[PDB]
Design a protein around this motif. Structure first.
Motif, PDB file in Angstrom:
ATOM      1  N   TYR A   1       0.726  -1.441   4.575  1.00  0.00           N
ATOM      2  CA  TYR A   1      -0.306  -0.068   4.986  1.00  0.00           C
ATOM      3  C   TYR A   1      -0.408   0.490   6.641  1.00  0.00           C
ATOM      4  CZ  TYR A   1      -5.686  -0.494   3.491  1.00  0.00           C
ATOM      5  OH  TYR A   1      -7.509  -0.829   3.284  1.00  0.00           O
ATOM      6  N   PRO A   2      -1.346   1.416   6.689  1.00  0.00           N
ATOM      7  CA  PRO A   2      -1.341   2.268   8.192  1.00  0.00           C
ATOM      8  C   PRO A   2      -1.585   1.011   8.873  1.00  0.00           C
ATOM      9  CG  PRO A   2      -1.508   4.013   6.100  1.00  0.00           C
ATOM     10  CD  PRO A   2      -1.378   1.993   5.518  1.00  0.00           C
TER      11      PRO A   2
ATOM     12  N   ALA B   1       0.855  -0.957  -0.002  1.00  0.00           N
ATOM     13  CA  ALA B   1       0.239  -0.124  -0.268  1.00  0.00           C
ATOM     14  C   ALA B   1       0.978   1.088   0.259  1.00  0.00           C
ATOM     15  CB  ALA B   1      -1.069   0.157   1.518  1.00  0.00           C
ATOM     16  N   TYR B   2       1.888   0.906   0.492  1.00  0.00           N
ATOM     17  CA  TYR B   2       2.956   2.450   0.735  1.00  0.00           C
ATOM     18  C   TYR B   2       2.516   3.664   1.245  1.00  0.00           C
ATOM     19  CZ  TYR B   2       5.498  -0.199  -3.274  1.00  0.00           C
ATOM     20  OH  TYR B   2       5.831  -0.991  -4.286  1.00  0.00           O
ATOM     21  N   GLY B   3       2.112   2.933   2.370  1.00  0.00           N
ATOM     22  CA  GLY B   3       0.987   4.349   3.495  1.00  0.00           C
ATOM     23  C   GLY B   3      -0.047   4.300   2.988  1.00  0.00           C
ATOM     24  N   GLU B   4       0.121   4.292   1.752  1.00  0.00           N
ATOM     25  CA  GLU B   4      -1.186   5.390   0.841  1.00  0.00           C
ATOM     26  C   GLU B   4      -2.469   4.164   0.339  1.00  0.00           C
ATOM     27  OE1 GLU B   4       1.307   7.955  -1.588  1.00  0.00           O
ATOM     28  OE2 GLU B   4       0.584   9.181   0.221  1.00  0.00           O
TER      29      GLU B   4
ATOM     30  N   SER C   1      -5.268   2.704  -1.626  1.00  0.00           N
ATOM     31  CA  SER C   1      -6.950   2.220  -2.064  1.00  0.00           C
ATOM     32  C   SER C   1      -8.465   1.957  -1.573  1.00  0.00           C
ATOM     33  CB  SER C   1      -6.185   1.856  -3.741  1.00  0.00           C
ATOM     34  OG  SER C   1      -5.993   0.836  -4.019  1.00  0.00           O
TER      35      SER C   1
END
Length: 229
Positions: free
Chosen positions: A178-179, A135-138, A140
Motif C-alpha cells: 500500500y503506498p 495492494a500492489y501499489g494500486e 482499490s
C-alpha cells in the motif's frame, strides 16, 4: 505440550508489573511512560480542531515494536498466523515458542480481520494479529476499506479485552504493498475518528515505525489530524 501456552498466560497474569520484567526477552524494553506523546513530540521531546487530551493519547515512535511495554502490539501477520518474515517473524521469535503454539490453535485469519493471543516473553501483554490487503501499489476502494478494517478490528479486540495501550506497525506497506503516504492518511484519519469516540477507553495509541521514511511521513501529517496549536 500443545497447551502449555495456557499456563504461561496464567503465570504472567499473576505477576506484578515489576516481576514480569525478569522474563522479557529483552533488557531494553521501552516503558510507556518513556514514549513521548504527540503533544511532547511536537515540542521536540525525543478541518480538525486541536484537542489537548487527544494529543496526549496518540504517539509516533521510531523503535522496535517488539520491545514496547504496552497492553498489546499489533502484528501485520499472514493468513496462517504462524509467522514468516518481516516484523511478524521477529515477534514470533521474541515472544518465544508459546506464541506460535497458541497461534497454531487458531483458524487462518481473513484480510481485514484480527485475532488476539498472549504476548508471552514480549514486554507486551498481548499480540493482536491482523492480515492486511496486498495492494500492489494500486489499491482499490475495497482495499482501502480492508486496510482501515485491520486497525478497527484490532481496536475491537483491544476494547473487548479491556486493554488500554496498543502499538501498530505500518500494516500493508512495503514492496508490492500500500503506498506509504496513502496508508498513513487512512491510518491518521481512522485513529483520529476512533479516538474522538473512544477517547477514555485507552491511554495510548502508538504508531510504531521502523523506517525513517515512515517516521517522516507520519510526522509531516500528524499536525493535520492532531493540531497542537
Amino acid at each position: 505440550t500443545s497447551t502449555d501456552w495456557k499456563e504461561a498466560k496464567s503465570f504472567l497474569k499473576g505477576l506484578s508489573d515489576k516481576q514480569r520484567e525478569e522474563h522479557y526477552f529483552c533488557k531494553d524494553f521501552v516503558r510507556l511512560k518513556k514514549i513521548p506523546t504527540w503533544k511532547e513530540m511536537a515540542k521536540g521531546v525525543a478541518r480538525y480542531k486541536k484537542d489537548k487530551q487527544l494529543n496526549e493519547k496518540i504517539s509516533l515512535l521510531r523503535s522496535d515494536i517488539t520491545k514496547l511495554e504496552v497492553d498489546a502490539i499489533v502484528n501485520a501477520a499472514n493468513s496462517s498466523l504462524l509467522g514468516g518474515g518481516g516484523v511478524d517473524g521477529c515477534i514470533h521469535r521474541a515472544a518465544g515458542p508459546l506464541l506460535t503454539d497458541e497461534c497454531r490453535t487458531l483458524q487462518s485469519c481473513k484480510t481485514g480481520k484480527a485475532k488476539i493471543t498472549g504476548g508471552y516473553r514480549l514486554p507486551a501483554k498481548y499480540v493482536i494479529h491482523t492480515v492486511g490487503p496486498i495492494a500492489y501499489g494500486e489499491p482499490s476502494a475495497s482495499q482501502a476499506a480492508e486496510l482501515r478494517s485491520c486497525y478497527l478490528s484490532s481496536l475491537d479486540l483491544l476494547l473487548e479485552h479491556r486493554l488500554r495501550s496498543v502499538a501498530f506497525p505500518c500494516i500493508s506497506t512495503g514492496v508490492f504493498g500500500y503506498p506509504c503516504e496513502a496508508a498513513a492518511e487512512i491510518v491518521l484519519a481512522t485513529l483520529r475518528e476512533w479516538l474522538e469516540q473512544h477517547k477514555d477507553k485507552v491511554d495510548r495509541l502508538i504508531i510504531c515505525v521502523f523506517l525513517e521514511k515512515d517516521e517522516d511521513i507520519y510526522r509531516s501529517r500528524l499536525p493535520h489530524y492532531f493540531p497542537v496549536a
